Structures are given as structure tokens and as C-alpha cells.
Design a protein around this nucleic acid. Sequence first.
RNA 1: ACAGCUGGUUCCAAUCGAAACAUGUCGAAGCAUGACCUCCGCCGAGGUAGUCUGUGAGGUAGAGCGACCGAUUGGUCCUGUCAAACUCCAAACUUACAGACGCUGUUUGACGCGGGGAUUCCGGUGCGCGGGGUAAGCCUGUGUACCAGGAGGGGAACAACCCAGAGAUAGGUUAAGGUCCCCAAGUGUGGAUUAAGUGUAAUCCUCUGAAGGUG
RNA 2: UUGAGGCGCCCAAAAUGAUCGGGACUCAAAUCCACCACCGAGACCUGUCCGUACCACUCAUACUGGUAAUCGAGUAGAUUGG
RNA 3: GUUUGACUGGGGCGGUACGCGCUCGAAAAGAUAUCGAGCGCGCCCUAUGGUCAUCUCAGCCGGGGACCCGGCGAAGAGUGCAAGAGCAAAAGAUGACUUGACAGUGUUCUUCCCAACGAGGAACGCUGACGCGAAAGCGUGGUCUAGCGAACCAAUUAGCCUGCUUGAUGCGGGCAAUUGAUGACAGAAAAGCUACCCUAGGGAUAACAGAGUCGUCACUCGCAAGAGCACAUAUCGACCGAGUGGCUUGCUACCUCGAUGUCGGUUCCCUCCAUCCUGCCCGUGCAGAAGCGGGCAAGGGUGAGGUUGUUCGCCUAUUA
RNA 4: UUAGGCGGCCACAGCGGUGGGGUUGCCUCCCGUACCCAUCCCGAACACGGAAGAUAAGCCCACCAGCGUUCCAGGGAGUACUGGAGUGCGCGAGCCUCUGGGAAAUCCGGUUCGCCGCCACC
Lengths: 160, 154, 186, 92, 95
Amino acid sequence: KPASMYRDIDKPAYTRREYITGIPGSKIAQHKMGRKQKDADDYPVQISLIVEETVQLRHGSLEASRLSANRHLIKELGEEGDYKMTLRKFPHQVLRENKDGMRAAFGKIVGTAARVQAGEQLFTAYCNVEDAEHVKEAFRRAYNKITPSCRIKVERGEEL
Amino acid sequence: MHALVQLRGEVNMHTDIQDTLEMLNIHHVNHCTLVPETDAYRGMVAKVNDFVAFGEPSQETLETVLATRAEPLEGDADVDDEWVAEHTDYDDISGLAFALLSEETTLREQGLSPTLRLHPPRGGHDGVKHPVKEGGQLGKHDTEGIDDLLEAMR
Amino acid sequence: ATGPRYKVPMRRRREARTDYHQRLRLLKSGKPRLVARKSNKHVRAQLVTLGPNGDDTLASAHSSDLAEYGWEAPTGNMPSAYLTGLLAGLRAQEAGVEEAVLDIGLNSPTPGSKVFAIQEGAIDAGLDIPHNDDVLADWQRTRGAHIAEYDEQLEEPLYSGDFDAADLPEHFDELRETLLDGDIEL
Amino acid sequence: MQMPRRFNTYCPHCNEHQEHEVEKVRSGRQTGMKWIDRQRERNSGIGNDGKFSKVPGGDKPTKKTDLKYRCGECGKAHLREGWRAGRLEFQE
Amino acid sequence: PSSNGPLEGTRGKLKNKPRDRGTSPPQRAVEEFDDGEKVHLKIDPSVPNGRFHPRFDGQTGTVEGKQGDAYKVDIVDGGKEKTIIVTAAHLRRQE
RNA sequence: ACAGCUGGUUCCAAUCGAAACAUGUCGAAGCAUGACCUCCGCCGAGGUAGUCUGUGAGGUAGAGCGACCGAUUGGUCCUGUCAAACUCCAAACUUACAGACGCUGUUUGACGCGGGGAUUCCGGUGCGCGGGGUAAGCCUGUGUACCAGGAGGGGAACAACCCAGAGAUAGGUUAAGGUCCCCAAGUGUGGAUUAAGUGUAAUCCUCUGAAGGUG
RNA sequence: UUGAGGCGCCCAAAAUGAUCGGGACUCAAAUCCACCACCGAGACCUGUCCGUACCACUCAUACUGGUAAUCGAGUAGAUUGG
RNA sequence: GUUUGACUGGGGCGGUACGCGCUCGAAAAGAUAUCGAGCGCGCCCUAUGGUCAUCUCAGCCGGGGACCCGGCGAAGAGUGCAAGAGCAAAAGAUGACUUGACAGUGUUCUUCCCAACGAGGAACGCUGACGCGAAAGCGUGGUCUAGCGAACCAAUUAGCCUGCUUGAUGCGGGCAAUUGAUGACAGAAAAGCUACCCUAGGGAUAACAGAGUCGUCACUCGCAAGAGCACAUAUCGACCGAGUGGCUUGCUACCUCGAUGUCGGUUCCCUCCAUCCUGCCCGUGCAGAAGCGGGCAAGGGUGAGGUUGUUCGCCUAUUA
RNA sequence: UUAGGCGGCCACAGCGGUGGGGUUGCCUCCCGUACCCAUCCCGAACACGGAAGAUAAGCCCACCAGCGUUCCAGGGAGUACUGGAGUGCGCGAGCCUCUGGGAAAUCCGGUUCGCCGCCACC
Ligand SMILES: [Cl-]
Ligand SMILES: [Cl-]
Ligand SMILES: [Cl-]
Ligand SMILES: [Cl-]
Ligand SMILES: [Cl-]
Ligand SMILES: [Cl-]
Ligand SMILES: [K+]
Ligand SMILES: [Mg+2]
Ligand SMILES: [Mg+2]
Ligand SMILES: [Mg+2]
Ligand SMILES: [Mg+2]
Ligand SMILES: [Mg+2]
Ligand SMILES: [Mg+2]
Ligand SMILES: [Mg+2]
Ligand SMILES: [Mg+2]
Ligand SMILES: [Mg+2]
Ligand SMILES: [Mg+2]
Ligand SMILES: [Mg+2]
Ligand SMILES: [Mg+2]
Ligand SMILES: [Mg+2]
Ligand SMILES: [Mg+2]
Ligand SMILES: [Mg+2]
Ligand SMILES: [Mg+2]
Ligand SMILES: [Mg+2]
Ligand SMILES: [Mg+2]
Ligand SMILES: [Mg+2]
Ligand SMILES: [Mg+2]
Ligand SMILES: [Mg+2]
Ligand SMILES: [Mg+2]
Ligand SMILES: [Mg+2]
Ligand SMILES: [Mg+2]
Ligand code: NA
Ligand code: NA
Ligand code: NA
Ligand code: NA
Ligand code: NA
Ligand code: NA
Ligand code: NA
Ligand code: NA
Ligand code: NA
Ligand code: NA
Ligand code: NA
Ligand code: NA
Ligand code: NA
Ligand code: NA
Ligand code: NA
Ligand code: NA
Ligand code: NA
Ligand code: NA
Ligand code: NA
Ligand code: NA
Ligand code: NA
Ligand code: NA
Ligand code: NA
Ligand SMILES: [Sr+2]
Ligand SMILES: [Sr+2]
Ligand SMILES: [Sr+2]
Ligand SMILES: [Sr+2]
Ligand SMILES: [Sr+2]
Ligand SMILES: [Sr+2]
Ligand SMILES: [Sr+2]
Ligand SMILES: [Sr+2]
Ligand SMILES: [Sr+2]
Ligand SMILES: [Sr+2]
Ligand SMILES: [Sr+2]
Ligand SMILES: [Sr+2]
Ligand SMILES: [Sr+2]
Ligand SMILES: [Sr+2]
Ligand SMILES: [Sr+2]
Ligand SMILES: [Sr+2]
Ligand SMILES: [Sr+2]
Ligand SMILES: [Sr+2]
Ligand SMILES: [Sr+2]
Ligand SMILES: [Sr+2]
Ligand SMILES: [Sr+2]
Ligand SMILES: [Sr+2]
Ligand SMILES: [Sr+2]
Ligand SMILES: [Sr+2]
Ligand SMILES: [Sr+2]
Ligand SMILES: [Sr+2]
Ligand SMILES: [Sr+2]
């Protein structure tokens, strides 16, 4: 199914699992990547991927963007490199589909999405000065698999 | 004391806004009333903000407007210095105009119509789609700004 | 105490001084309350009406201001209870109060107890309080016969200070008589 | 529900409380001499008999209480508004 | 509404804020109002007896006599005049 | 013959001027009773479409959750997110009554009461807020103004977009919008950008143009 | 070297004849920022008349005089004069 | 001879949103729709009702998943049943007593906001008689909101009225109220077929065509994991993401039901490009030859046949 | 109020903690069961009678802010949201300008360890 069916935030907040049953599990493997034992403050450079429009990103897109981002970080910095990336948004909004015509139209549950407001941080990676252009490329590959246009904002980078 | 001028029509206008203008004795487009500055009266012009043109007139301008557009409570009779003298509590137009500005009396209280039915603006106005800060003619005006409109509507 | 959701009871309930459930029922009559309190050494009896900023006391009597009329005996017993109640009811009649309802507070409604004796006193003073005759003590226990007959089981005196040996419940009769008198400085 | 055979309650006849006995109203037998019985024999002819051609309807899932409150002293009975009860048993 | 009962949509108005939980103070439950007095109708969630239909919560009626201990309060519902039987516990004085 | 169904029902003018909704109905192509329109008689001084202030009602927006509740990360306290059927918080705003100003009524009698006659109960559109649906010139709510039943001006044409609510006639000035021609009015002025005929397209089924990219 | 903004370009495929209404337009007849003067309704102002309503006079709803900034659009329908 | 209901993104099948209650929807007063989301009621209880007395619960901790003692503990316990709400010297627990779950008659709100409408319901009185309590007081059933039924007829309760000139007897007629069901729940006693059909109408509503939409279908683009002996990018290319078209399908119900002739085929004309061939090109995993992929490009061409009504599709031999 | 009784508002009053205070006065603890009354067992409690002793609890008095709370300042923030208007912008989702209102979290610093009424009383 296309994202055009679920990208907008025009529907009510539908998250209460105590009233919603049959919700498919998140396709997302892990939110904490890299060296999850080290601190975020132990890094001189902090670069975040910021979403420019207010959208709803599906779990499949969140995973597809996370995968192609971390896979580049694993390729360039190794499986145990000195970095740590975090996916701070979780897929809370439950999605329906009406799959009988328009009679009894309330659809059956088909998935989960993440309501991300404009200007919000979707991803945040912490790295060392030398590995800065690798993480800027991990995000260039990641923003290609979500719905909005994005910003690659450096929060702790006076080294340029 | 502010001078209100309805610059936008009644069609599509909210009923509660329409009725506020009727309470301020202003029933047609280009009509003008002299409203005092109270809390009660300010709540009224704020609700009319987008369909009107207001601000404080200058003594010189109020006089010009009163001479040309003021009417008695009934009749065609021109309001000149002699009319004022024989019917009002003042000596001339200036004496009445000073009282209206200092909020000592109202046009109704003196036997004059609460409406100064003006002429369309000569050279036209700055527009009825935008406020004054955006280059239009709606909302609050400068004392020099309201004069330009009141004088053009002689 | 714990957080924002915590409910702290009303002040006189934390203090465990007022039974607010019984108070509501007491106030439903519209009549002034005959507040009957008892301490270890003393006994209090008030006539309370409802006011705008709190309760109003129009007439009261404490067992300590009983000695002002001639008492020379202890103040936390049955004869003292009636008299403190009679003295409260008499001051009440002078205040323009005619009827009342018995507020025993947190005390137990035990038959023939001191709070019911305070009530018997006010009834005899001229006040119209809804009562029950067989829940009150028999006239001799009110007089103080139980105490005099305990001094009969002597060997050692009951009283420390010198009032008298075998005890006089006749002092009660003499005091009821002194208060029943039309003169007396109330 | 369970209900006591005898209990104290108001007798609208004696104007005072007495010990009443409760009994389930036993249906009285019909005489066949009422007006409705005469109209049945009269109005019934060839073909459909209209109202007399109908059959008694169904039932409600639970019936109401159909009791008789017999007074212990004067011996006169009274009726009360009943309530829905699936089964009504008596105690003693 | 999914049902036309009296307590429909009254989760908010007939519930106390956590700190206002438990038995209410008696002083207001025995308050004496005189005729002609303007009073504020608001149900106390802690008091079960002597309420009114929740649709009238927020009205400011006029006391026009009493029926037993409860008061007969005259209100105007939209344009229709109504008489509400209510106890003192759910009434507050105007001004 | 009966029909709750289609069609038709013939002269002029003046005043007021809707409902397309609620309850009941073998009811949903119909009725009745209310809302609402109109007419008559009565009563007799107040009324309340606006605003301000005062005394009350409220849990939507937002927010937040070691404040309940329930979702929902990782690490050896710290660290990562949420809620139509959550709330330690909390508006704008709507709403009861009262006072004040305004407006209005006391020969145009308001507010109100009683009676006669209805029509009406297929609605639609814009805007705001919605709920459902991939969506719809979709379906179904709500507040409001409009079309319906609203001319005239503008928008190429065009029920509801803009101006504007309109007796006849006549002179004048403007509104929306427009001033190169068609076509009334500028080939106006100061400055800058664009080289694609981008553009000369407020709103829109109607006018597209996206992610991504551009020494 | 890097950051930000403006206008444009790529991305960009549809069936009888292409289009901003058409012509045609390039330091504009486009776009943005200011400004100047005009054109342009039945609106607004103004002369006369008409209808309706109310006031004065009147038997009159006959004349005469007056007031309307706060009267003048209307389907179904109620009312009334011809 | 008749009946064989209504609702409904047409109708039917399914379902009941056909009488009721709670939360959300509902936009912080009131009102508010959908075959809207979550889910309930058509009883049960002689105590699980009523009053009074005595008392404080879940959970955790320490001492000897039973029991005993202490401490912490405003409420997470319990309160018949949905849901929301109320409650702690109680509305919960225990104990005892009691029958007010009483008769009569009302005021008021609700049912039905506003705003008319029955049954039903509730709040709040009074009259009479009662229960408990010391008493104020509490008890008009269950802490609150679901647990319900007209006329006619019958039975039933107590007293009384009444039946044609008249008395007696029988058997009737009535005033007041209780019970008996109509759940299609403001109440008819009620099954189907019609392609043999008929009529009244409707584009108020379906099939076909158009129109909107584009989930489906077709085509493309972004990123490029991956494989391709090494090499992403000769070639193939996932995930995810952005779109174009209006050929398929689906949706909607705007247009026509006083008729816009069906599918397939045929014949004859014009067109689109997302190009199969032909022309000119680029790359190659391009020696050549034969290819593979891509670009510009719509001038011309794209044919004959076997099964099948077929469109589609399968098959044959020819063909640039 | 040299310690009391009944209250109102019902945390600004709560949780926790420190210091002080009582010869015939007050409140307590305290002493003690013949009686009224009392425990499904216990004069523990309830009830009754009383002062040998005490200020250690409670209570009354003064004070501390760590926690919870009330209010205020400054910052967050005129941000979020929003009633009215717009031939303003944007393919759109949405945004912006003008006008009238205007949070919440959190941070820092103050406040708050109850206020008030009637009565009685060295
Ligand atoms: Cl006491
Ligand atoms: Cl039975
Ligand atoms: Cl009510
Ligand atoms: Cl109009
Ligand atoms: Cl061109
Ligand atoms: Cl005529
Ligand atoms: K047709
Ligand atoms: Mg005039
Ligand atoms: Mg001009
Ligand atoms: Mg303009
Ligand atoms: Mg709510
Ligand atoms: Mg006519
Ligand atoms: Mg005429
Ligand atoms: Mg929110
Ligand atoms: Mg019409
Ligand atoms: Mg020209
Ligand atoms: Mg173009
Ligand atoms: Mg027949
Ligand atoms: Mg049907
Ligand atoms: Mg109904
Ligand atoms: Mg509401
Ligand atoms: Mg029948
Ligand atoms: Mg029977
Ligand atoms: Mg029905
Ligand atoms: Mg036919
Ligand atoms: Mg149609
Ligand atoms: Mg091509
Ligand atoms: Mg060709
Ligand atoms: Mg052939
Ligand atoms: Mg001490
Ligand atoms: Mg636009
Ligand atoms: Na179906
Ligand atoms: Na016969
Ligand atoms: Na309370
Ligand atoms: Na017929
Ligand atoms: Na109907
Ligand atoms: Na019909
Ligand atoms: Na919002
Ligand atoms: Na007034
Ligand atoms: Na309708
Ligand atoms: Na209109
Ligand atoms: Na036109
Ligand atoms: Na062009
Ligand atoms: Na007409
Ligand atoms: Na039927
Ligand atoms: Na009723
Ligand atoms: Na036939
Ligand atoms: Na498309
Ligand atoms: Na189609
Ligand atoms: Na054909
Ligand atoms: Na070609
Ligand atoms: Na073939
Ligand atoms: Na036992
Ligand atoms: Na002490
Ligand atoms: Sr929507
Ligand atoms: Sr993107
Ligand atoms: Sr016969
Ligand atoms: Sr027969
Ligand atoms: Sr049945
Ligand atoms: Sr509202
Ligand atoms: Sr020029
Ligand atoms: Sr220029
Ligand atoms: Sr079209
Ligand atoms: Sr557009
Ligand atoms: Sr772009
Ligand atoms: Sr092409
Ligand atoms: Sr006219
Ligand atoms: Sr007219
Ligand atoms: Sr038949
Ligand atoms: Sr269908
Ligand atoms: Sr009750
Ligand atoms: Sr006879
Ligand atoms: Sr059958
Ligand atoms: Sr056949
Ligand atoms: Sr070729
Ligand atoms: Sr053949
Ligand atoms: Sr086909
Ligand atoms: Sr086939
Ligand atoms: Sr002892
Ligand atoms: Sr788009
Ligand atoms: Sr302010």
C-alpha cells in the first residue's frame, strides 16, 4: 500500500490498545544502535535528522530508513565503530483499512505509524569529528525513505 | 472619542456584527458615528474592527464633517453655526465639536442624527480587504490617517 | 501529604473531635444544640446556635464555676453533671433560648451516663429537649447515692481533701434548691 | 426470590399495622354469562367472526407478582402493585 | 448520544477533583435561603440526595418557596419556565 | 372505483414572509403534534440581537504524566516515546443571572397571552470544527452565512467566490475589480529579480505538479 | 570553505485543433517592494416623483402639511384594495 | 378473501444502529447524525431491603498464601450486573433488631433540551400507620443512571352505585385498583412464487454509458541493499519513499428510467506514445556475426490462419 | 485560650523534624472498679469513681522547608492554542498578516510548618 493512504494527520489520535485489538507488531528491530553502552555526552559531534513537514511515518518506512542508515554506518565505521544512533520516535498511531462497500466502513487494523511534527528530531547520531561526513551520508540515505523533506542539523559541530 | 465608518457591506457579514453596527446607529455603507472611548464601547468597535474604519478625528476635521454631513434629528435643515446656536448648548460648530471630542455630550443628546452620512472617498480608499498596517483601510487609524478618509468623504 | 491526589480530612476530623456525619443530622432540626462535654476532672455544657463564620455560644456552664454557688465536692461526677446542666439551662432561659437538641459529640449514648444527666438538668431548667426518660439515671444515682454507698465500704476514705467522711448527697439537694430560687445572680 | 408467608404491614381497612398472610391469587372460574360471552354467541356467524376469530397471544419472559395480602385480625384482603420475579417461593 | 438517560455525558460535571473527594461540609447543606433570592445551581458530587437533572447545572434561579426541606427554585430553560426541587447542598448565593 | 403516485388548476396590486428540522406513526414518495410563517382580539411597561463588569457552570485546544491510567526504548539513578473512550494542569470560547452603556417599546403597544389560516418535515454550497472513507462533484454531524426564494457590478462563460442586498427617474462619487489592444481608464513612477513565454491562473471537480536534484 | 535567502531549470507521457478569455507581451503587458493618477455598480451622496408606515388636521381610509440614518429584493404561504 | 412490516451508501442475503443504559464520538453550558468506536439491559435479592450498634479496607512490612500481635496504609478494598460516577468514625465490614419493598394523595423534573406528546422513571412533600434510635434523624426498596407495556376482555381486592310499572330471587351493567402481552417494545390476528405477467411512478434508487475518485490496474521517478567469478549502476534489481495516466477493477450515486439499443465481430475514418518493425544515435559482460539495454523519433508498417460467441488467451507457419 | 469547648474555610492547615511548658488552676496521661454501663475474651475500649504520681506521649507554645501544597516574582512565552478578518503564501498538507484573548511543562528565587468566628477562663 502507498504512503498516500496514511501520511497525513487528518484522523483522530487512535492509540488506546485497551479498545483496539489485532495490532501488527512493529517491523522496527532496535531504536538504540552502535555502542549502546557509551554515553551521548562522550561525543564531540551530535548530528540530528530533522523532519520539515508534519507527517505520519509508518513502521515499515521507519525501519527501511533506519536500516539503510545504520547499514552505511556499519559499512564505513565497522560493526563496533565509535558511534551511537538513536531513533527517538515510536509508532503509536494505529492504522485502519476498509478492505461490503461503504456500509460498515470502519476498517480493520492493518498497521502502525509515528506522528512526527515539523521541526522534530527523528534520528540523532553522536560521533567523533573524523566520522562526521559518514553520518551525514547515513542520513542522506535515510531521508530518501521517509515522506517529508529533511534537514541534517549539526548540534555540537564547531569543527569545520 | 473615535469616529466609526462602515466600509464593508451587510451581505455575508455575521448577524452579531450587523446588530452591533445597528446599535452604534450605523445602518449603511459610508455612514459615520461618533463613539466615546469606554470599556463597553471599545468591546463594540473591536467586534466591528474588520468591517469598519476608526480613529480619533482632529478638531479641524470634525468641524468640516459636521458642517457638511450633520443633519437634525428630523429634516433637511443644514447644520451651520446659526443652526447650532439656536438649537444646541453651544455657540458655533467649534463649540459642539470640542464637546463631542471631550465626550461631554452626544449628537442625539443635542437633537442631531447620530449618523453623519458621508460621500464615497474622493480618489478612493486604500482597500477593504486589508488593515491599515498592511496598506488597506480597515481597522484603527492615525489621527492624521482618519482625517484623510473623513476629508475625502466630505 | 503524598502528592496532589491525596485527600487530607477536614481539620476537626484529623483532630478526631467532630463526627461530621452526626453533626449534619443534629443541625437538621433547626433547634440550638445542647453541647454536652466531659473531661476527667470537669464537665462542660453549652447552648450552641449556627452562625455565619462559625458556631455561636449563647449560654454555657462549666463545673468549675459551680463552686461560685456553694459546691465543695469534686467536679467530674454524676451530681456535678446534672447541676452543670441545670446551670446551663438557666442561663439559656435568660438568653431567650427555649428549645434544644442534645449533642453528646464523640461520647457513647450509654444509659444513665453523665451526658444524659447534663440533659436531665437542662430539661428541669425549663428547656424543651427531645429525650427518653428510661435512658436517664434513676433520681438517686443523679443525687449521688452510688458514691455515698461506696464510702460505706470504707476502711480508708474515698476523698483525700477534707469535704466530709460518709459524703453528703444532701449538698446536691441544697444546690438544686439554690439554683431553683428566683433570685440568684446567674 | 424468597418471601415470608406472614409479616407485619399496613391494613388500609383497619387503618393500623397488623400481621398479614400472603397467598398467590388463584384464578376464579368463568360463568359464561357475562356480556362478552353473549356477544360471542350473538356476533358469530358465517365466515370470519372478527375479534372472536383471534387466538390468545404469547408470554413475557418473566411475569409480575400476583399476590393477595390477607389481614390477620379483620380477615379482609388488599392488593399491591407487583414486581417482576422469575420464581416466588414462600418461607414457612 | 448512544442513550437518552439522565447521567448521559456527565463524567465531568458529576465528579469531584481528587482533593474535593469524600463527605462535604454540613454548613452549606443546612443553609437557609429566603424567597426571591437568586441562587446558583451546581450539584455537589459527594451529596447523593436532593439533586436535580444535570442539564440544569450552571443555572441561576430564583427561590420561590420550599417543599419540605428542599427548595422550589424557579429557572428559565431556554424560553420555558421550570420549577426545580433542590436541597441547599447544591445551592450557593448570588453575589 | 380507490391511490400517500405523475400532470394540470385561468385577472392586477400592496404588507409580512418561511420550513427543508424535532416527537409519534405498518412510518420513511404520507400524516399528526411541535419548531417556524401570517392574521385577529387581549394585556399594559418594560425588552435584551452587542459590549463591559460582577456572581456562577465547563474539561475541548494546548500541555503533561516519580499526577492516576494504559501504552511504549536501552544501559550499567540514568536514558527514548505516546493517548477519542488518560488527567497534577489548562485556555480561546460557549453558557445562567444581574448591573451599566447601547439599541428598543409605552398614538409605530414592545415583552407577553389567547384564538383563526397556513406552508413545511427530498435541501444544497462556502467557511470553521468535525466523525467515517485511499479518495470522491462521497457519506453523516455541528456553528455560521449564503443558494434555494437574491437583482445589479466583477470573475471569459458559471445557484451559492469577491462587491453589493434592489421603488421610478436623473446628476455625481466610489466598491469589487481593472488602466497595451480587444475594452472604460497608465504602454504611469522609483528600484530589483526572472530568460523559463517561467509567468500574465485569489477561491476551484475546474487553476496541478511531488520526492529527489541544480557552479 | 561553509551557512541562508530570491527567481528560474530538471524531475514532467494521451488520445479531433495549442493556449493566460484571445491578441500578443521580455530594463514587461511577468515577479517582488514602494509610490502617483485614473477607469469602474442599481452601492454612497444628491434633485423630483411613487408606494407603504406613522404624526397633525378631519367624519374621511377625502384634502393639506409633516417624519422615515434607524421604510421599499423574495419561492411556499397568511393578509388586504382593485 | 387476504396477509406476508420497517431500517438499509438501490434491493436481497447478513445484520437490528426497531424499546432501554454507560464511555468516546460531541467541537470545556444545552442539543447533536452515520450499518460510528468500546459494551451492556429485558433480572437477581426477605436480604443482597430498613434502622441502630460496633468497626475499617486492599497491598506491603516485622513477630509467631490458614489464624494471632504490631507497624505503614485517603481508598488501590468493598458496594448483585455494563460503563462512567459516589462513598471511610461510611454508602464498605460485622452484629442485632425490623418489614417504609407500607396505604392514600400530590408538587416537580424526566420521558420529549429548547418546544407540544402517553406508558414508564426519578426527585421532593403531605395524610395515615409503622420500624429503628437516647435523639436530632433515617426508612416513599437495592448509592446513581438499564431491568419495560394502551384500549377491549378475563381473573382478582374492598365498599358502594345500578338493570325499562312493582316486590322477591337469579344472573347481569358500573365507580377504584392489582395481575394476564403486544421485543415491529406510543400495541394489525398474517407465508411464498411469477421468465405468463399488469399498473402507478422514480434517475428520490440499481444494471449499461457518462461523470468524480484511484484503493485496484498500467507506467515512471527517488534511494540503491543485493548479484552480476572482482566489480550496484553491461544487465538484473529488493525494501522504503515520490508520482503520472484514466486501458482494468472497485467505490460514489452527480446525469438519463414520458428509453442516449447489448457483448463480440465486421466495415470506414481520425488520433495518442508509454515505440513491436523501419531511420538516426549511446552503452555493452561491444572481436566479428547474432544480441542485450538505453536515447531521439508517431512518416510508413504491424499481415494469414486452427479451437473458442468470446474480449482475453492458447496454438501454427510465414514476417523487417 | 499558663495548656479549654463548639466551629468556619477544609493541605497556606499535609508528611517529617528540633526546642520549651505546668503544686491546691486547665487539658492530659495517670490511679482504681461498689455502683450506671461495658467487652461474641479482656474496666484495653466503652462507662463510672478519684488524685498517689508525671510533663515522658498528647495537647498548648516557639521554630526548621527536606517532601506534598497555596500564592507571587523573574525566565520559558506573548511561545502553544484561539474568537474575528484577508483576491496574503503554499501542488498540497499547511502557513502568514491584522485584530481581540492567552496557556502548560520545567528552571531560579520568594511564600506557606494555618487563617478566622463564638464562648469560657489570672
Ligand atoms: Cl467530651
Ligand atoms: Cl406471584
Ligand atoms: Cl430537575
Ligand atoms: Cl436585504
Ligand atoms: Cl509565447
Ligand atoms: Cl388598484
Ligand atoms: K435511460
Ligand atoms: Mg432624518
Ligand atoms: Mg475616480
Ligand atoms: Mg481595492
Ligand atoms: Mg467530556
Ligand atoms: Mg397578485
Ligand atoms: Mg397597491
Ligand atoms: Mg490534546
Ligand atoms: Mg425551492
Ligand atoms: Mg481603452
Ligand atoms: Mg503556463
Ligand atoms: Mg376487499
Ligand atoms: Mg425498503
Ligand atoms: Mg420512543
Ligand atoms: Mg455538551
Ligand atoms: Mg386486543
Ligand atoms: Mg387474574
Ligand atoms: Mg415504535
Ligand atoms: Mg411499470
Ligand atoms: Mg440520481
Ligand atoms: Mg519517449
Ligand atoms: Mg501517425
Ligand atoms: Mg477466421
Ligand atoms: Mg515536653
Ligand atoms: Mg492555493
Ligand atoms: Na453487505
Ligand atoms: Na342479534
Ligand atoms: Na467534598
Ligand atoms: Na388505493
Ligand atoms: Na418520517
Ligand atoms: Na407515502
Ligand atoms: Na487544534
Ligand atoms: Na438596560
Ligand atoms: Na428533512
Ligand atoms: Na438571503
Ligand atoms: Na458575469
Ligand atoms: Na506561456
Ligand atoms: Na408570494
Ligand atoms: Na405486517
Ligand atoms: Na409521567
Ligand atoms: Na398476472
Ligand atoms: Na493520478
Ligand atoms: Na472508473
Ligand atoms: Na459491436
Ligand atoms: Na511512426
Ligand atoms: Na483465434
Ligand atoms: Na461465634
Ligand atoms: Na506534655
Ligand atoms: Sr478527515
Ligand atoms: Sr523524502
Ligand atoms: Sr347476529
Ligand atoms: Sr364461524
Ligand atoms: Sr417470549
Ligand atoms: Sr459547545
Ligand atoms: Sr509602464
Ligand atoms: Sr520597474
Ligand atoms: Sr469537468
Ligand atoms: Sr492550486
Ligand atoms: Sr524540490
Ligand atoms: Sr514525447
Ligand atoms: Sr418595492
Ligand atoms: Sr416587499
Ligand atoms: Sr398475493
Ligand atoms: Sr450494493
Ligand atoms: Sr437512595
Ligand atoms: Sr321485571
Ligand atoms: Sr419459504
Ligand atoms: Sr423458463
Ligand atoms: Sr529501432
Ligand atoms: Sr475456420
Ligand atoms: Sr472486456
Ligand atoms: Sr481464458
Ligand atoms: Sr485502669
Ligand atoms: Sr502531493
Ligand atoms: Sr494582556
